[PDB]
Amino acid sequence: TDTFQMFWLDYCEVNNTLILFGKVKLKDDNCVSAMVQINGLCRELFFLPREGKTPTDIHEEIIPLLMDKYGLDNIRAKPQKMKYSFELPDIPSESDYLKVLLPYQTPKSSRDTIPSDLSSDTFYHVFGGNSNIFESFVIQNRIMGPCWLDIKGADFNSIRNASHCAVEVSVDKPQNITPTTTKTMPNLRCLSLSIQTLMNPKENKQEIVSITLSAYRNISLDSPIPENIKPDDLCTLVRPPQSTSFPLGLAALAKQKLPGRVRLFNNEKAMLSCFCAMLKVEDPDVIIGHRLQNVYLDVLAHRMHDLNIPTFSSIGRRLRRTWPEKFGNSNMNHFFISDICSGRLICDIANEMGQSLTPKCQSWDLSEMYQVTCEKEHKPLDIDYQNPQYQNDVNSMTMALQENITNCMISAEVSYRIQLLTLTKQLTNLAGNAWAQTLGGTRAGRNEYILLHEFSRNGFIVPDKVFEPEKGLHKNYVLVMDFNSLYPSIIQEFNICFTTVDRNKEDIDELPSVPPSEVDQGVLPRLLANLVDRRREVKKVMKTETDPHKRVQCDIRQQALKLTANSMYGCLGYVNSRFYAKPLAMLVTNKGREILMNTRQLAESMNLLVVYGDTDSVMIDTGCDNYADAIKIGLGFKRLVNERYRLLEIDIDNVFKKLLLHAKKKYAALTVNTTVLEVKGLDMKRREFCPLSRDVSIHVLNTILSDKDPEEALQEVYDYLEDIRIKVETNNIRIDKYKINMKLSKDPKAYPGGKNMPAVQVALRMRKAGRVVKAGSVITFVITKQALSVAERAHALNEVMIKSNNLIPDPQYYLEKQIFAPVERLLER
The missing domain is CATH 2.40.50.730 (OB fold (Dihydrolipoamide Acetyltransferase, E2P))
Incomplete structure (x- = not known):
């Protein structure tokens, strides 16, 4: 009060x-x-006394010398016993240190840090010299x-x-x-941003054409966010992509066709100025988007810089009148932007964190994420503002803006559906780091801080900053077993820790041995045990909980605890980790191999076959053709594995009624959830193939993976193909189905080997005819019959559709290059 x-x-x-x-x-x-x-x-420094010397001896030497360099009247310092258990070889397990509190703000030389290898006859090492200020605050004040x-x-x-x-x-x-x-x-103010750009070929510069802003001013993470939540405000800003003026009627058509406000500006500088002003007034806590972090925020920042927008700092919450001096160095650009955005959390659904929550995606394109996470379809328009039609065609401009508006609201909806904010918040509270670092970083950050807090609180000094796949069709149900908990169970079971494993800190390649049962549980294992215990506590509460709100909350909590535990290995395994320890990593890795090797023998003891396996997952052929029988085998294997490894609790992640396997992430299968077709790694290049080809391939798989006998179905395939071969030769298939799209990365006249590319030949034929076509233009064509080259025989789809042009598809090409080659791979095994 x-x-x-x-x-x-x-x-x-x-x-x-x-x-x-x-x-x-x-x-x-x-x-x-x-x-x-x-x-x-202040920075917390710990000076390590020399053999025979004491902390008081240190106090006498450096304190007066420190008062001079920094120009301080007095410096708080005192002896303190601290434990050390990390990779520096010459430091003992426990010692009396001199803890010196050196302010970050000092009258003199405040930017000069004390090196760890400072020469002195009283001490031979100094910890905490390069301490980061956020880190110091969070660790000293126990902020989680x-x-x-x-x-x-x-x-x-x-x-x-x-x-x-x-x-x-x-x-x-x-x-x-x-x-x-x-x-x-408190409720959070969220603002979804969607930006449409334009590539200026002159300077190779990305320029901004329009911006859509959708505001959600009361997002409560304390309760589930309602699906399809509507924004409190929706606004779109746009400047002319070509000239200083828009097509006539644009404003009247916008009010008529487009939702929310539309604001027109005569140029980009004016637009971005209004944007910054809107950001300030809106004052959002979170900016939501798709690929903001390393694509569009960069473009946005540099354009505000290029056009000297004075209110650029409103993208963050600190006010600056001028940009950083060095803004303009590749890597440093990331820090500057992140720093300028400080105060507003960047919620990017397609960055590393966003991807980690959406493993069922493959490209993480906006439309794809929308399909996977929301089970809704959106057909993306390829907007190219370089095209001249957007300067005089009002309807084109309007459709392009609609695409932007749609993407903006899709990005938001997805971010809420995948619970990107709550999960990241919970992960942040568990690790004790910054929310921004969780949203925009890798696992390492969380891994780092969870240990920094854990060790510092118990008087420790922290460091300064496989089974090859069985390729083929599997007729029996195959189960994907989750082994993510492998390493955290090993670390816990065998009490592996920085404090427990006697290791040679001179030779890091030397393999150590697990500690004898007599040694007390270490910090890392105890941390993991607590995380596992709390997770059970949560799952117990869930079974009883009736309220859907509290229950959903529990499920989020439970997930976060799991992710935290299953990320712990990174602490000591990742080469560039602050807590990297090779002897421990190797130790945990070797035990991991044994368990997996023995997991195989166990599977075989149940007469199961290991189809594929690694440290994350193991695929097993159940030998059954029924979901029930398959699940029972799966649970039986689960129980067997746990009986031999009490702390290893694996589970069923994926159920494959059928499995056409080539590699871990290269397969087709009928997954069960209601059976459904699923293809991974075999849907890379759809663009190069026409609808007929894709219809053929899909139909072939369906029938092959069908629950029909492998001969009648395979005959159904030939009856299908042969029938397709006759229909192609007699040209009784829609001309639409032969269409092939191809985007031009560069101007047609500058394409090397253009004579070989059908799209280029058709594009050049439009030029010499009169019509305009540049880089970024999508060429839709069909290969026709009459020796003439395939490229020469290529013609625009619209031309081929007009019967009076007497153009027909070439059977030779479509039967060989479009239907045979792809199937030759589908049915190789």
């Missing part, structure tokens, strides 16, 4: 301070944005991801015009900030 309370979401570093962005509740129960500037943070923060001694008059937030305060010391236990959170 006397403290400033904020729910923190994101952060940024500046002038050796730490700024937290979050939300504050007002007297009308509404929540607005807020920022907190944190001063007084986004949560409510009690902030005492908040100064409401110190900060002036620093942010795009409604409330700005500061604090003199980080100890004034403590986390609360409150489990609920």
Whole structure:
């Protein structure tokens, strides 16, 4: 009742301070944005005494020397016993250190860090020199991801015009900030962004043509988000792709045909200026999109830079009048943009995190994700604003904007359906890192912080920053068994930890041995055990829970706990990990091979056949032709594996009634859920083949994988093909089915070997005729019969459809290159 309370979401570093962005509740129960500037943070350094020396000896040497370099009056320092258990060979298991608190903000040389290998006759190592300020705050104050923060001694008059937030305060010391236990959170303001660009061939520059903004101002993660939730506001901005003016009637047609507002601008600079202004006023907590992180945010940033947009900083929540000096270095561009966006969470459904939640996808194209996650179909329009029709054709312009609007709302809907926010929040609360790092990073970040918190809290010093596939058709049900928990069960079962495994820190290639049963449970195994235990606690509560809201919540919690545990191996296995330890990785890997090798023998002891296997999954031929019998075999195998390995709990992930297998991610099959056809890795190049070819291939699979005898079905195939061969020769198939699309990456006159490419020959024939066609143009053609080359015989579809042109499809080409070659692979085995 006397403290400033904020729910923190994101952060940024500046002038050796730490700024937290979050939300504050007002007297009308509404929540607005807020920022907190944190001063007084210090790096925690630990100086390691020399043989015979003490911490007091160290205090006498460096403290006075540190006061000089940094120009400090006094420096807090004191002896402290700390444990060490990582890869530096010359440091003991436990020692008395001198803990020195060195402020980030210092009068002198504040940007100069103390090296770990600092020369001295009292100590021979220094930990914590290069500490990151966010890390220091989070670890010292035990902050575990986004949560409510009690902030005492908040100064409401110190900060002036620093942010795009409604409330700005500061604090003199980080100890004034403590986390609360409150489990609920405020509603989030989400803004879905969809951007349409244009490639300027002159400068090879990506330019922005339009932007759609869909606002959802009350997304509550405390309850499930309702499907097909409608936006509170929808607006589209657009500039002319070619000239300074749009086609006539555009505004009247927009109001008539397009949902939400449409705003027209005379140029891109004006458009982007309005965009920034809208962002500021909307003040969203989350920006949702598809491929924002490493495609469109880059384009957006550079264009605001190119066009010198003064209000560019409103993409984030800190106010800057000028860009960073070095903005313009390849890799550094990522940091600058991420830094500028600080304050607003980037919810990208198609980045690494987004993909990890949607393993059933293959391309992660927007329309594909929409199909997989929402079971809805959207046929994507290929909009090319280079085409001249968009400068005078009002209907084309309108359809293109509709495509943008649709994509914007699809991106949002998908992000909610795959529960990208709640899952990432839970993952962040479990690992103790930043929500932004979880949304936009790899697993390593979570892996890193979960250990940083775990070890630091128990007085530890942390480090400074397969079975080849059986190719063919499998007639018996094949089950895919999930072995994701393999490594975390090994680490737990054999008590493998940085603190338990005696290892030679000189030669990291030397294989160590697991600790004897006498050794107490280590930090890493205990962490895993706790995660597994809590997961069970949740699943127990679920069985009883009646309320669908709380139940759905439990399922999210349960998932997060699982993902956290199954990512732990990365901590010690990933080469570039802060906690990388080769002796441990090898130790866990070898035990993993044994278990898998023995898992094979176990399968065979039940008269099962291992079709494929690796550390993540094992595929088993059940030998049954019935779902029930297959599942029972599957569970029997599950029980058998657990009896031999008490901590290894595998499960059935995929059920294949039939399986045409080539590799782990290259197969066709009838999956059960209601049987359904599923193809992976064999649907790469659909574009190069016509509808007839794709209709043939699909029909062939269906019949082959059908529950019909393998001769009658295979005869049904020949009766089908032969019939297709006669229909092609007599040309009694729709001309549509022969069509082949091909996009031009470069201008037709500059295509090397154009004489061989049918699309180019047809494109050039349009030029010499008169019609215009450039790079990016999609050529639809059909190979015709009359020696003339295949490319020469290629003609535009619309031409071939006109009977009076006397053009017919060439049987030779379509029977050999379009029907034979593809099938020659389908029926190889």
